[PDB]
Structures are given as C-alpha cells and as structure tokens.
Amino acid sequence: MNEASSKFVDNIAIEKLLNEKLLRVSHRPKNLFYDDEKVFDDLCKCETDMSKVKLAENLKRFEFPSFLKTEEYIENNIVYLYYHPAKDPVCNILLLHGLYDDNMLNYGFLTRMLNELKFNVFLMELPFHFNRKPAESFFSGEYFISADLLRARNAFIQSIYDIEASRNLIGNINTLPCLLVGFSMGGCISFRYHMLRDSFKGTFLINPVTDMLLLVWDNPLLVKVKKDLEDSGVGKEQVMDVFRIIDPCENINTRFNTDNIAVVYSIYDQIVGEEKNAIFVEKIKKAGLKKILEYHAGHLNILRVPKLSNDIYEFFMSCL
C-alpha cells in the first residue's frame, strides 16, 4: 500500500471516531479496588453449556452465555459468534475485531479470502460492542474503554473468558484445529489469552495494541478518557496498575509457547505509531517470539490487503 493513502485512512477514521463519538460522552472512575491474586485460575475449568446455546439465521450466528455476567448491563451477558463456513475446511479461525468497531462488513474481504484457503471463520463480538452494547450506551464499545476503569478492566477480562467459551463451542461443532486471530485491540486480548491457555494450534496478531498500561495516557482516541481521569484526580500510576494483570508485555515472563504465535505490524500505523511498535517488537523478541512481519500498510487498510490471508495460511502450515 501507499504511504500517504494509508496514513489518510487511519487519520480520518480517528477524526470521525473522536468527533461523532468519543468527545461526546463522559465517564467517572468509581472504585479502584481489585485483587490480582486469582484472576484466571478458573479459566481451564469453564465449559459452555450446549443446552444454553442458540443458533440464529440469511447469515449465521451462535448465541451463548458469557461466563462473566455483568448484571447492570444485560445486553452484554450473551456472546455472539458469526459463522462463515468454508467449503472443505482444514481449520477454524476465531477472529476478534478492534476497539469501537461498529461495522462487521469491514472484515468481509479477509473472511472471504480465508474461506477460499479452507478456513472456517468465527467472528466474535467483543463485550459492550455490536449486539453486546447496553441500550443506554451511545456507541459500540464505549463501555469497554472509558474512565470507568474497573469496567474496562472487567471487560478485557471477560473477553478472555469469551474466547474460552467460543473455543469450547467450536470444539463441539467440529474436531478441526483452531487458530486465534486478533486485530488491533482484539490482538492485544488474544495475545493475553495465548499466554494463559494452550488451547489453539497457534495465534496470529494483526497490528495489535501494544501496551494497555499506557494506552489511555498516549493513544489519541483516548484523549478525553484521560481528561475525565485527570479531572477526577486519577493519575498515571493508578491507571497502569489497574491494567497490569491484563497487559501482555507486563506478564510476558510467564511460561508459554512462543513458537506458535505470529505478529504482523504495520509501518504506516497512525493509531499505534512507530515508537510503540519498536518497543513492542523489542520486548516480544526478548521473550523469544520469531514470527514477526512488517507490512507496508496502516492500521485499518491492512484488512483489505490480500497477502494477509496468505501469511495466516503460511503460519497455519509452518514449523511451530
């Protein structure tokens, strides 16, 4: 892709998101009490109850209970999972989208191309997004990252339990192997799930978010979330702390498989930027990841890039 073109896509999407959405709402931090001690000890144990699954159809959608209820936000306690089956499939992909996404159709080029390479694609809705959005929320994803930091922290945690649920579900549909694929924030989430659980053949991150500690302080989409917090007397250190347990790099010294995880980043990426990527890259090398691919794209336009499907296929087929 072209440089200036890629930069333009990213920048007008930032501006639209800020102006139509993120600058029009406001949120309070509330109770910053949390215990990190046992946060994923359940995770291996959880099992999707097949009696409580539903399948809704023109286009196919599994619905099932999220293992983590949020009683306040009733619409979010169901996970939705869009089934895009391949003809003669070799593998399942579980595909997670980015933050504040509100348009499933942006993933169709990828979904299709992967479907041609003989992948089933399951696309999971992230907590507080799409049909998981609470009716009082102004837009898809608002409640996921807002100055309600405990809610943000719990939404990230929930996503991880939802991957598990989705995985367990998928295991009952067929016995094919599974890949976890995460775009942007879905990438950061998938990274964390990978460290916690060896339930996928491998994991492929696509222009992931690189650091949840600093995300709110530096990411330009989050400029008013930071302000909300600064006016509430919440400082940098508190924010970093609340996200420590959910951040991949912060926990990167744990015991996990570093051979079956591939990462793509994009050199024109305006959302993440080149500095955060260079830091992310250095830290993931120091931990022993190898499959790292530079793309000549920005953050969003990469979803329309043909090569992406092919690298995911190479990765499925590679030495792990």
Side-chain angles (χ1 to χ4, degrees), residues 1-318 320:
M1 311 291 252
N2 177 35
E3 174 168 4
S5 179
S6 302
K7 288 180 161 142
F8 162 79
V9 174
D10 278 359
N11 296 320
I12 70 168
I14 289 166
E15 213 182 315
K16 190 189 166 154
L17 261 164
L18 280 178
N19 284 305
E20 290 185 351
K21 287 177 176 174
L22 270 312
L23 303 172
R24 304 199 170 171
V25 309
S26 205
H27 289 291
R28 303 263 154 289
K30 294 198 316 176
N31 46 282
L32 302 202
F33 315 122
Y34 52 86
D35 185 59
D36 287 350
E37 287 190 9
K38 290 183 193 203
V39 171
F40 305 109
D41 295 44
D42 303 291
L43 227 193
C44 46
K45 254 62 128 297
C46 294
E47 213 149 59
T48 303
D49 185 349
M50 299 291 287
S51 77
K52 299 191 158 161
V53 177
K54 296 189 199 196
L55 190 250
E57 214 103 61
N58 141 270
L59 194 312
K60 347 193 166 132
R61 197 170 62 184
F62 296 92
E63 311 186 356
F64 51 89
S66 169
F67 302 130
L68 276 153
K69 265 58 189 170
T70 162
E71 163 166 306
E72 292 167 78
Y73 310 118
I74 78 109
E75 291 97 346
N76 178 49
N77 310 316
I78 292 98
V79 178
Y80 299 92
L81 198 67
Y82 295 82
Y83 177 46
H84 297 269
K87 184 216 196 292
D88 301 293
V90 305
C91 191
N92 301 308
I93 282 152
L94 178 69
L95 171 58
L96 273 67
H97 65 76
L99 179 70
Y100 313 133
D101 278 359
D102 74 353
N103 189 358
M104 207 79 78
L105 272 12
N106 300 321
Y107 298 91
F109 180 83
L110 217 206
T111 291
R112 172 177 203 74
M113 279 204 82
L114 290 173
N115 273 171
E116 286 171 354
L117 293 158
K118 299 180 134 82
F119 287 107
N120 289 313
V121 182
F122 298 80
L123 182 10
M124 191 187 87
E125 297 194 352
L126 253 34
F128 301 116
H129 286 72
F130 298 106
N131 291 289
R132 309 187 70 177
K133 195 210 80 202
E136 75 242 51
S137 175
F138 201 50
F139 57 93
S140 169
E142 187 188 1
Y143 287 15
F144 199 112
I145 310 288
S146 58
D148 196 341
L149 294 177
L150 200 81
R151 182 174 61 191
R153 169 186 170 105
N154 293 329
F156 196 111
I157 295 163
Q158 194 183 6
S159 304
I160 294 183
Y161 277 79
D162 295 344
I163 288 163
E164 187 73 30
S166 298
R167 173 66 187 78
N168 182 239
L169 175 48
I170 291 162
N172 290 37
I173 296 156
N174 63 57
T175 64
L176 302 169
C178 310
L179 253 38
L180 176 65
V181 186
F183 173 72
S184 191
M185 170 68 73
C188 178
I189 294 161
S190 292
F191 197 179
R192 188 75 253 243
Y193 179 92
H194 194 84
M195 296 167 47
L196 296 158
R197 300 252 30 230
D198 63 331
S199 47
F200 287 82
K201 193 206 281 300
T203 290
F204 196 102
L205 316 179
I206 309 172
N207 293 348
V209 158
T210 59
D211 175 6
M212 296 295 308
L213 312 197
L214 284 163
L215 175 61
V216 173
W217 234 244
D218 308 337
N219 188 292
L221 288 169
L222 273 27
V223 70
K224 194 172 169 181
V225 174
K226 186 189 193 165
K227 235 69 187 48
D228 283 350
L229 297 165
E230 282 184 306
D231 302 358
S232 309
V234 173
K236 176 148 154 182
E237 305 300 334
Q238 283 191 62
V239 186
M240 293 175 87
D241 246 289
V242 73
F243 294 125
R244 285 196 141 88
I245 198 61
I246 61 71
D247 180 65
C249 286
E250 185 71 357
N251 294 279
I252 203 151
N253 293 300
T254 55
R255 170 160 180 284
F256 67 105
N257 196 341
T258 54
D259 292 317
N260 71 341
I261 171 146
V263 175
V264 176
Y265 71 103
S266 288
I267 71 169
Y268 307 129
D269 194 317
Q270 296 304 291
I271 280 146
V272 172
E274 53 195 280
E275 294 187 58
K276 288 176 174 297
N277 277 328
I279 287 158
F280 184 65
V281 162
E282 199 272 340
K283 279 167 186 206
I284 60 167
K285 292 189 182 201
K286 189 154 168 297
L289 288 76
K290 322 176 284 189
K291 302 172 144 54
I292 312 198
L293 312 186
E294 254 177 52
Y295 270 42
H296 284 247
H299 188 77
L300 297 165
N301 78 2
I302 195 184
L303 298 173
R304 296 189 263 98
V305 172
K307 191 181 181 266
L308 219 203
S309 285
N310 292 113
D311 287 324
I312 294 173
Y313 180 81
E314 287 219 357
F315 173 76
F316 177 66
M317 286 322 280
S318 63
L320 299 174

